[PDB]
């Protein structure tokens, strides 16, 4: 029920503003001073300008390094988030990965949905759930997900915890 | 702490799936069956096909009424989220509201950021904080936001509670 730092960086629904206090709402108390995510009155910084930082809430990072939506952000120059240009990846783009866990399709484009995540998906949130590590010949994971104890890719206590075969383990 | 139904529709950072248990992570335990938001393996329905329901995580609602990112979801016939087309609103669209609290700019386009939410913002999360209520000749807020006892528009207990003047006041 908490958002931002107080709620493990959780984001509010429907672009509600996460106040300084870790509560979702709308109006000055939430979006004004200290707003952590959502439609903050002051746009958070991103992309080169903030040295590669992502925008919260799938916002577009403009050519000037500001977070938002609309042509100004998502259009010409967009540096991240759901940009209007088609985003290339995988084998077709020198092995690049999609930002924010997007699935790299069999064709080499970044998205979400079964066309991207389904059979052939190369990296990110694939729905294919292909085995990793030991019982699958030292096969890591894309994105540095953790290869559980079952040679299963993911993130969370169960993949990064104890028995963690590869990637981003918890120690 | 929790996301989804368990955490007031709280969403996970970076497209992580919210499992049926209200926790954020990645893999088939979070994204598989019962996933609530983020990169779910089963895309939610939206738009006309699902009687106006909007996607979580600012995903695009395709022409076919499925949530996702990429050209098939945000391109032609996109019905919501950060569509590739400039989305019309406000006067320039007969008073229509932008979805998900987005700002309606002065020129009648939906977005987030100064250029949309600042000076001339018509509806949504404007940051101009124009006064409402008794002291502002009884103007009501757009979007059914609450007019607090002090003449400010927002959503939260300070706005919708004790002394709320108009909008979705608590009762």
């Amino acid at each position: 029920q908490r958002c931002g730092e107080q709620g493990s960086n959780m984001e509010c629904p429907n672009n509600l503003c996460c106040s300084q206090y870790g509560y979702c709402g709308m109006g000055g108390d939430y979006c004004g001073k200290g707003c952590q995510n959502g439609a903050c009155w002051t746009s958070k910084r991103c992309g080169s300008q903030a040295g590669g930082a992502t925008c919260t809430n799938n916002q577009c990072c403009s050519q000037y390094g500001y977070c938002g939506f609309g042509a100004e952000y998502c259009g010409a120059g967009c540096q991240g988030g759901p940009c209007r240009a088609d985003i290339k990846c995988g084998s077709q783009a020198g092995g690049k990965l999609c930002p924010n866990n997007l699935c790299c399709s069999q064709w080499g484009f970044c998205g979400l949905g079964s066309e991207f995540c389904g059979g052939g998906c190369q990296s990110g949130a694939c729905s294919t759930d292909k085995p990793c590590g030991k019982d699958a010949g030292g096969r890591v994971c894309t994105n540095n997900y953790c290869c559980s104890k079952w040679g299963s890719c993911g993130i969370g206590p169960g993949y990064c915890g104890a028995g963690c075969q590869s990637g981003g383990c918890d120690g | 702490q929790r996301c989804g139904e368990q955490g007031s529709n709280m969403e996970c950072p970076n497209n992580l799936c919210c499992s049926q248990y209200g926790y954020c992570g990645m893999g088939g335990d979070y994204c598989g069956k019962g996933c609530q938001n983020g990169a779910c393996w089963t895309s939610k329905r939206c738009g006309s096909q699902a009687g106006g329901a909007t996607c979580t995580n600012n995903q695009c609602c395709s022409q076919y009424g499925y949530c996702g990112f990429g050209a098939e979801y945000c391109g032609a016939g996109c019905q919501g989220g950060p569509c590739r087309a400039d989305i019309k609103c406000g006067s320039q669209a007969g008073g229509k509201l932008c979805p998900n609290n987005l700002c309606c700019s002065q020129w009648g386009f939906c977005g987030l950021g100064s250029e949309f939410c600042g000076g001339g913002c018509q509806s949504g999360a404007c940051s101009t904080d124009k006064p409402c209520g008794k002291d502002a000749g009884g103007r009501v807020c757009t979007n059914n936001y609450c007019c607090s006892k002090w003449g400010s528009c927002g959503i939260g207990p300070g706005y919708c509670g004790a002394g709320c003047q108009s909008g979705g006041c608590d009762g």
Partner: peptide, 8 residues
């Protein structure tokens, strides 16, 4: 593009 049952 297929998997999971979509109504039609």
């Amino acid at each position: 593009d297929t998997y999971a049952a979509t109504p039609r």
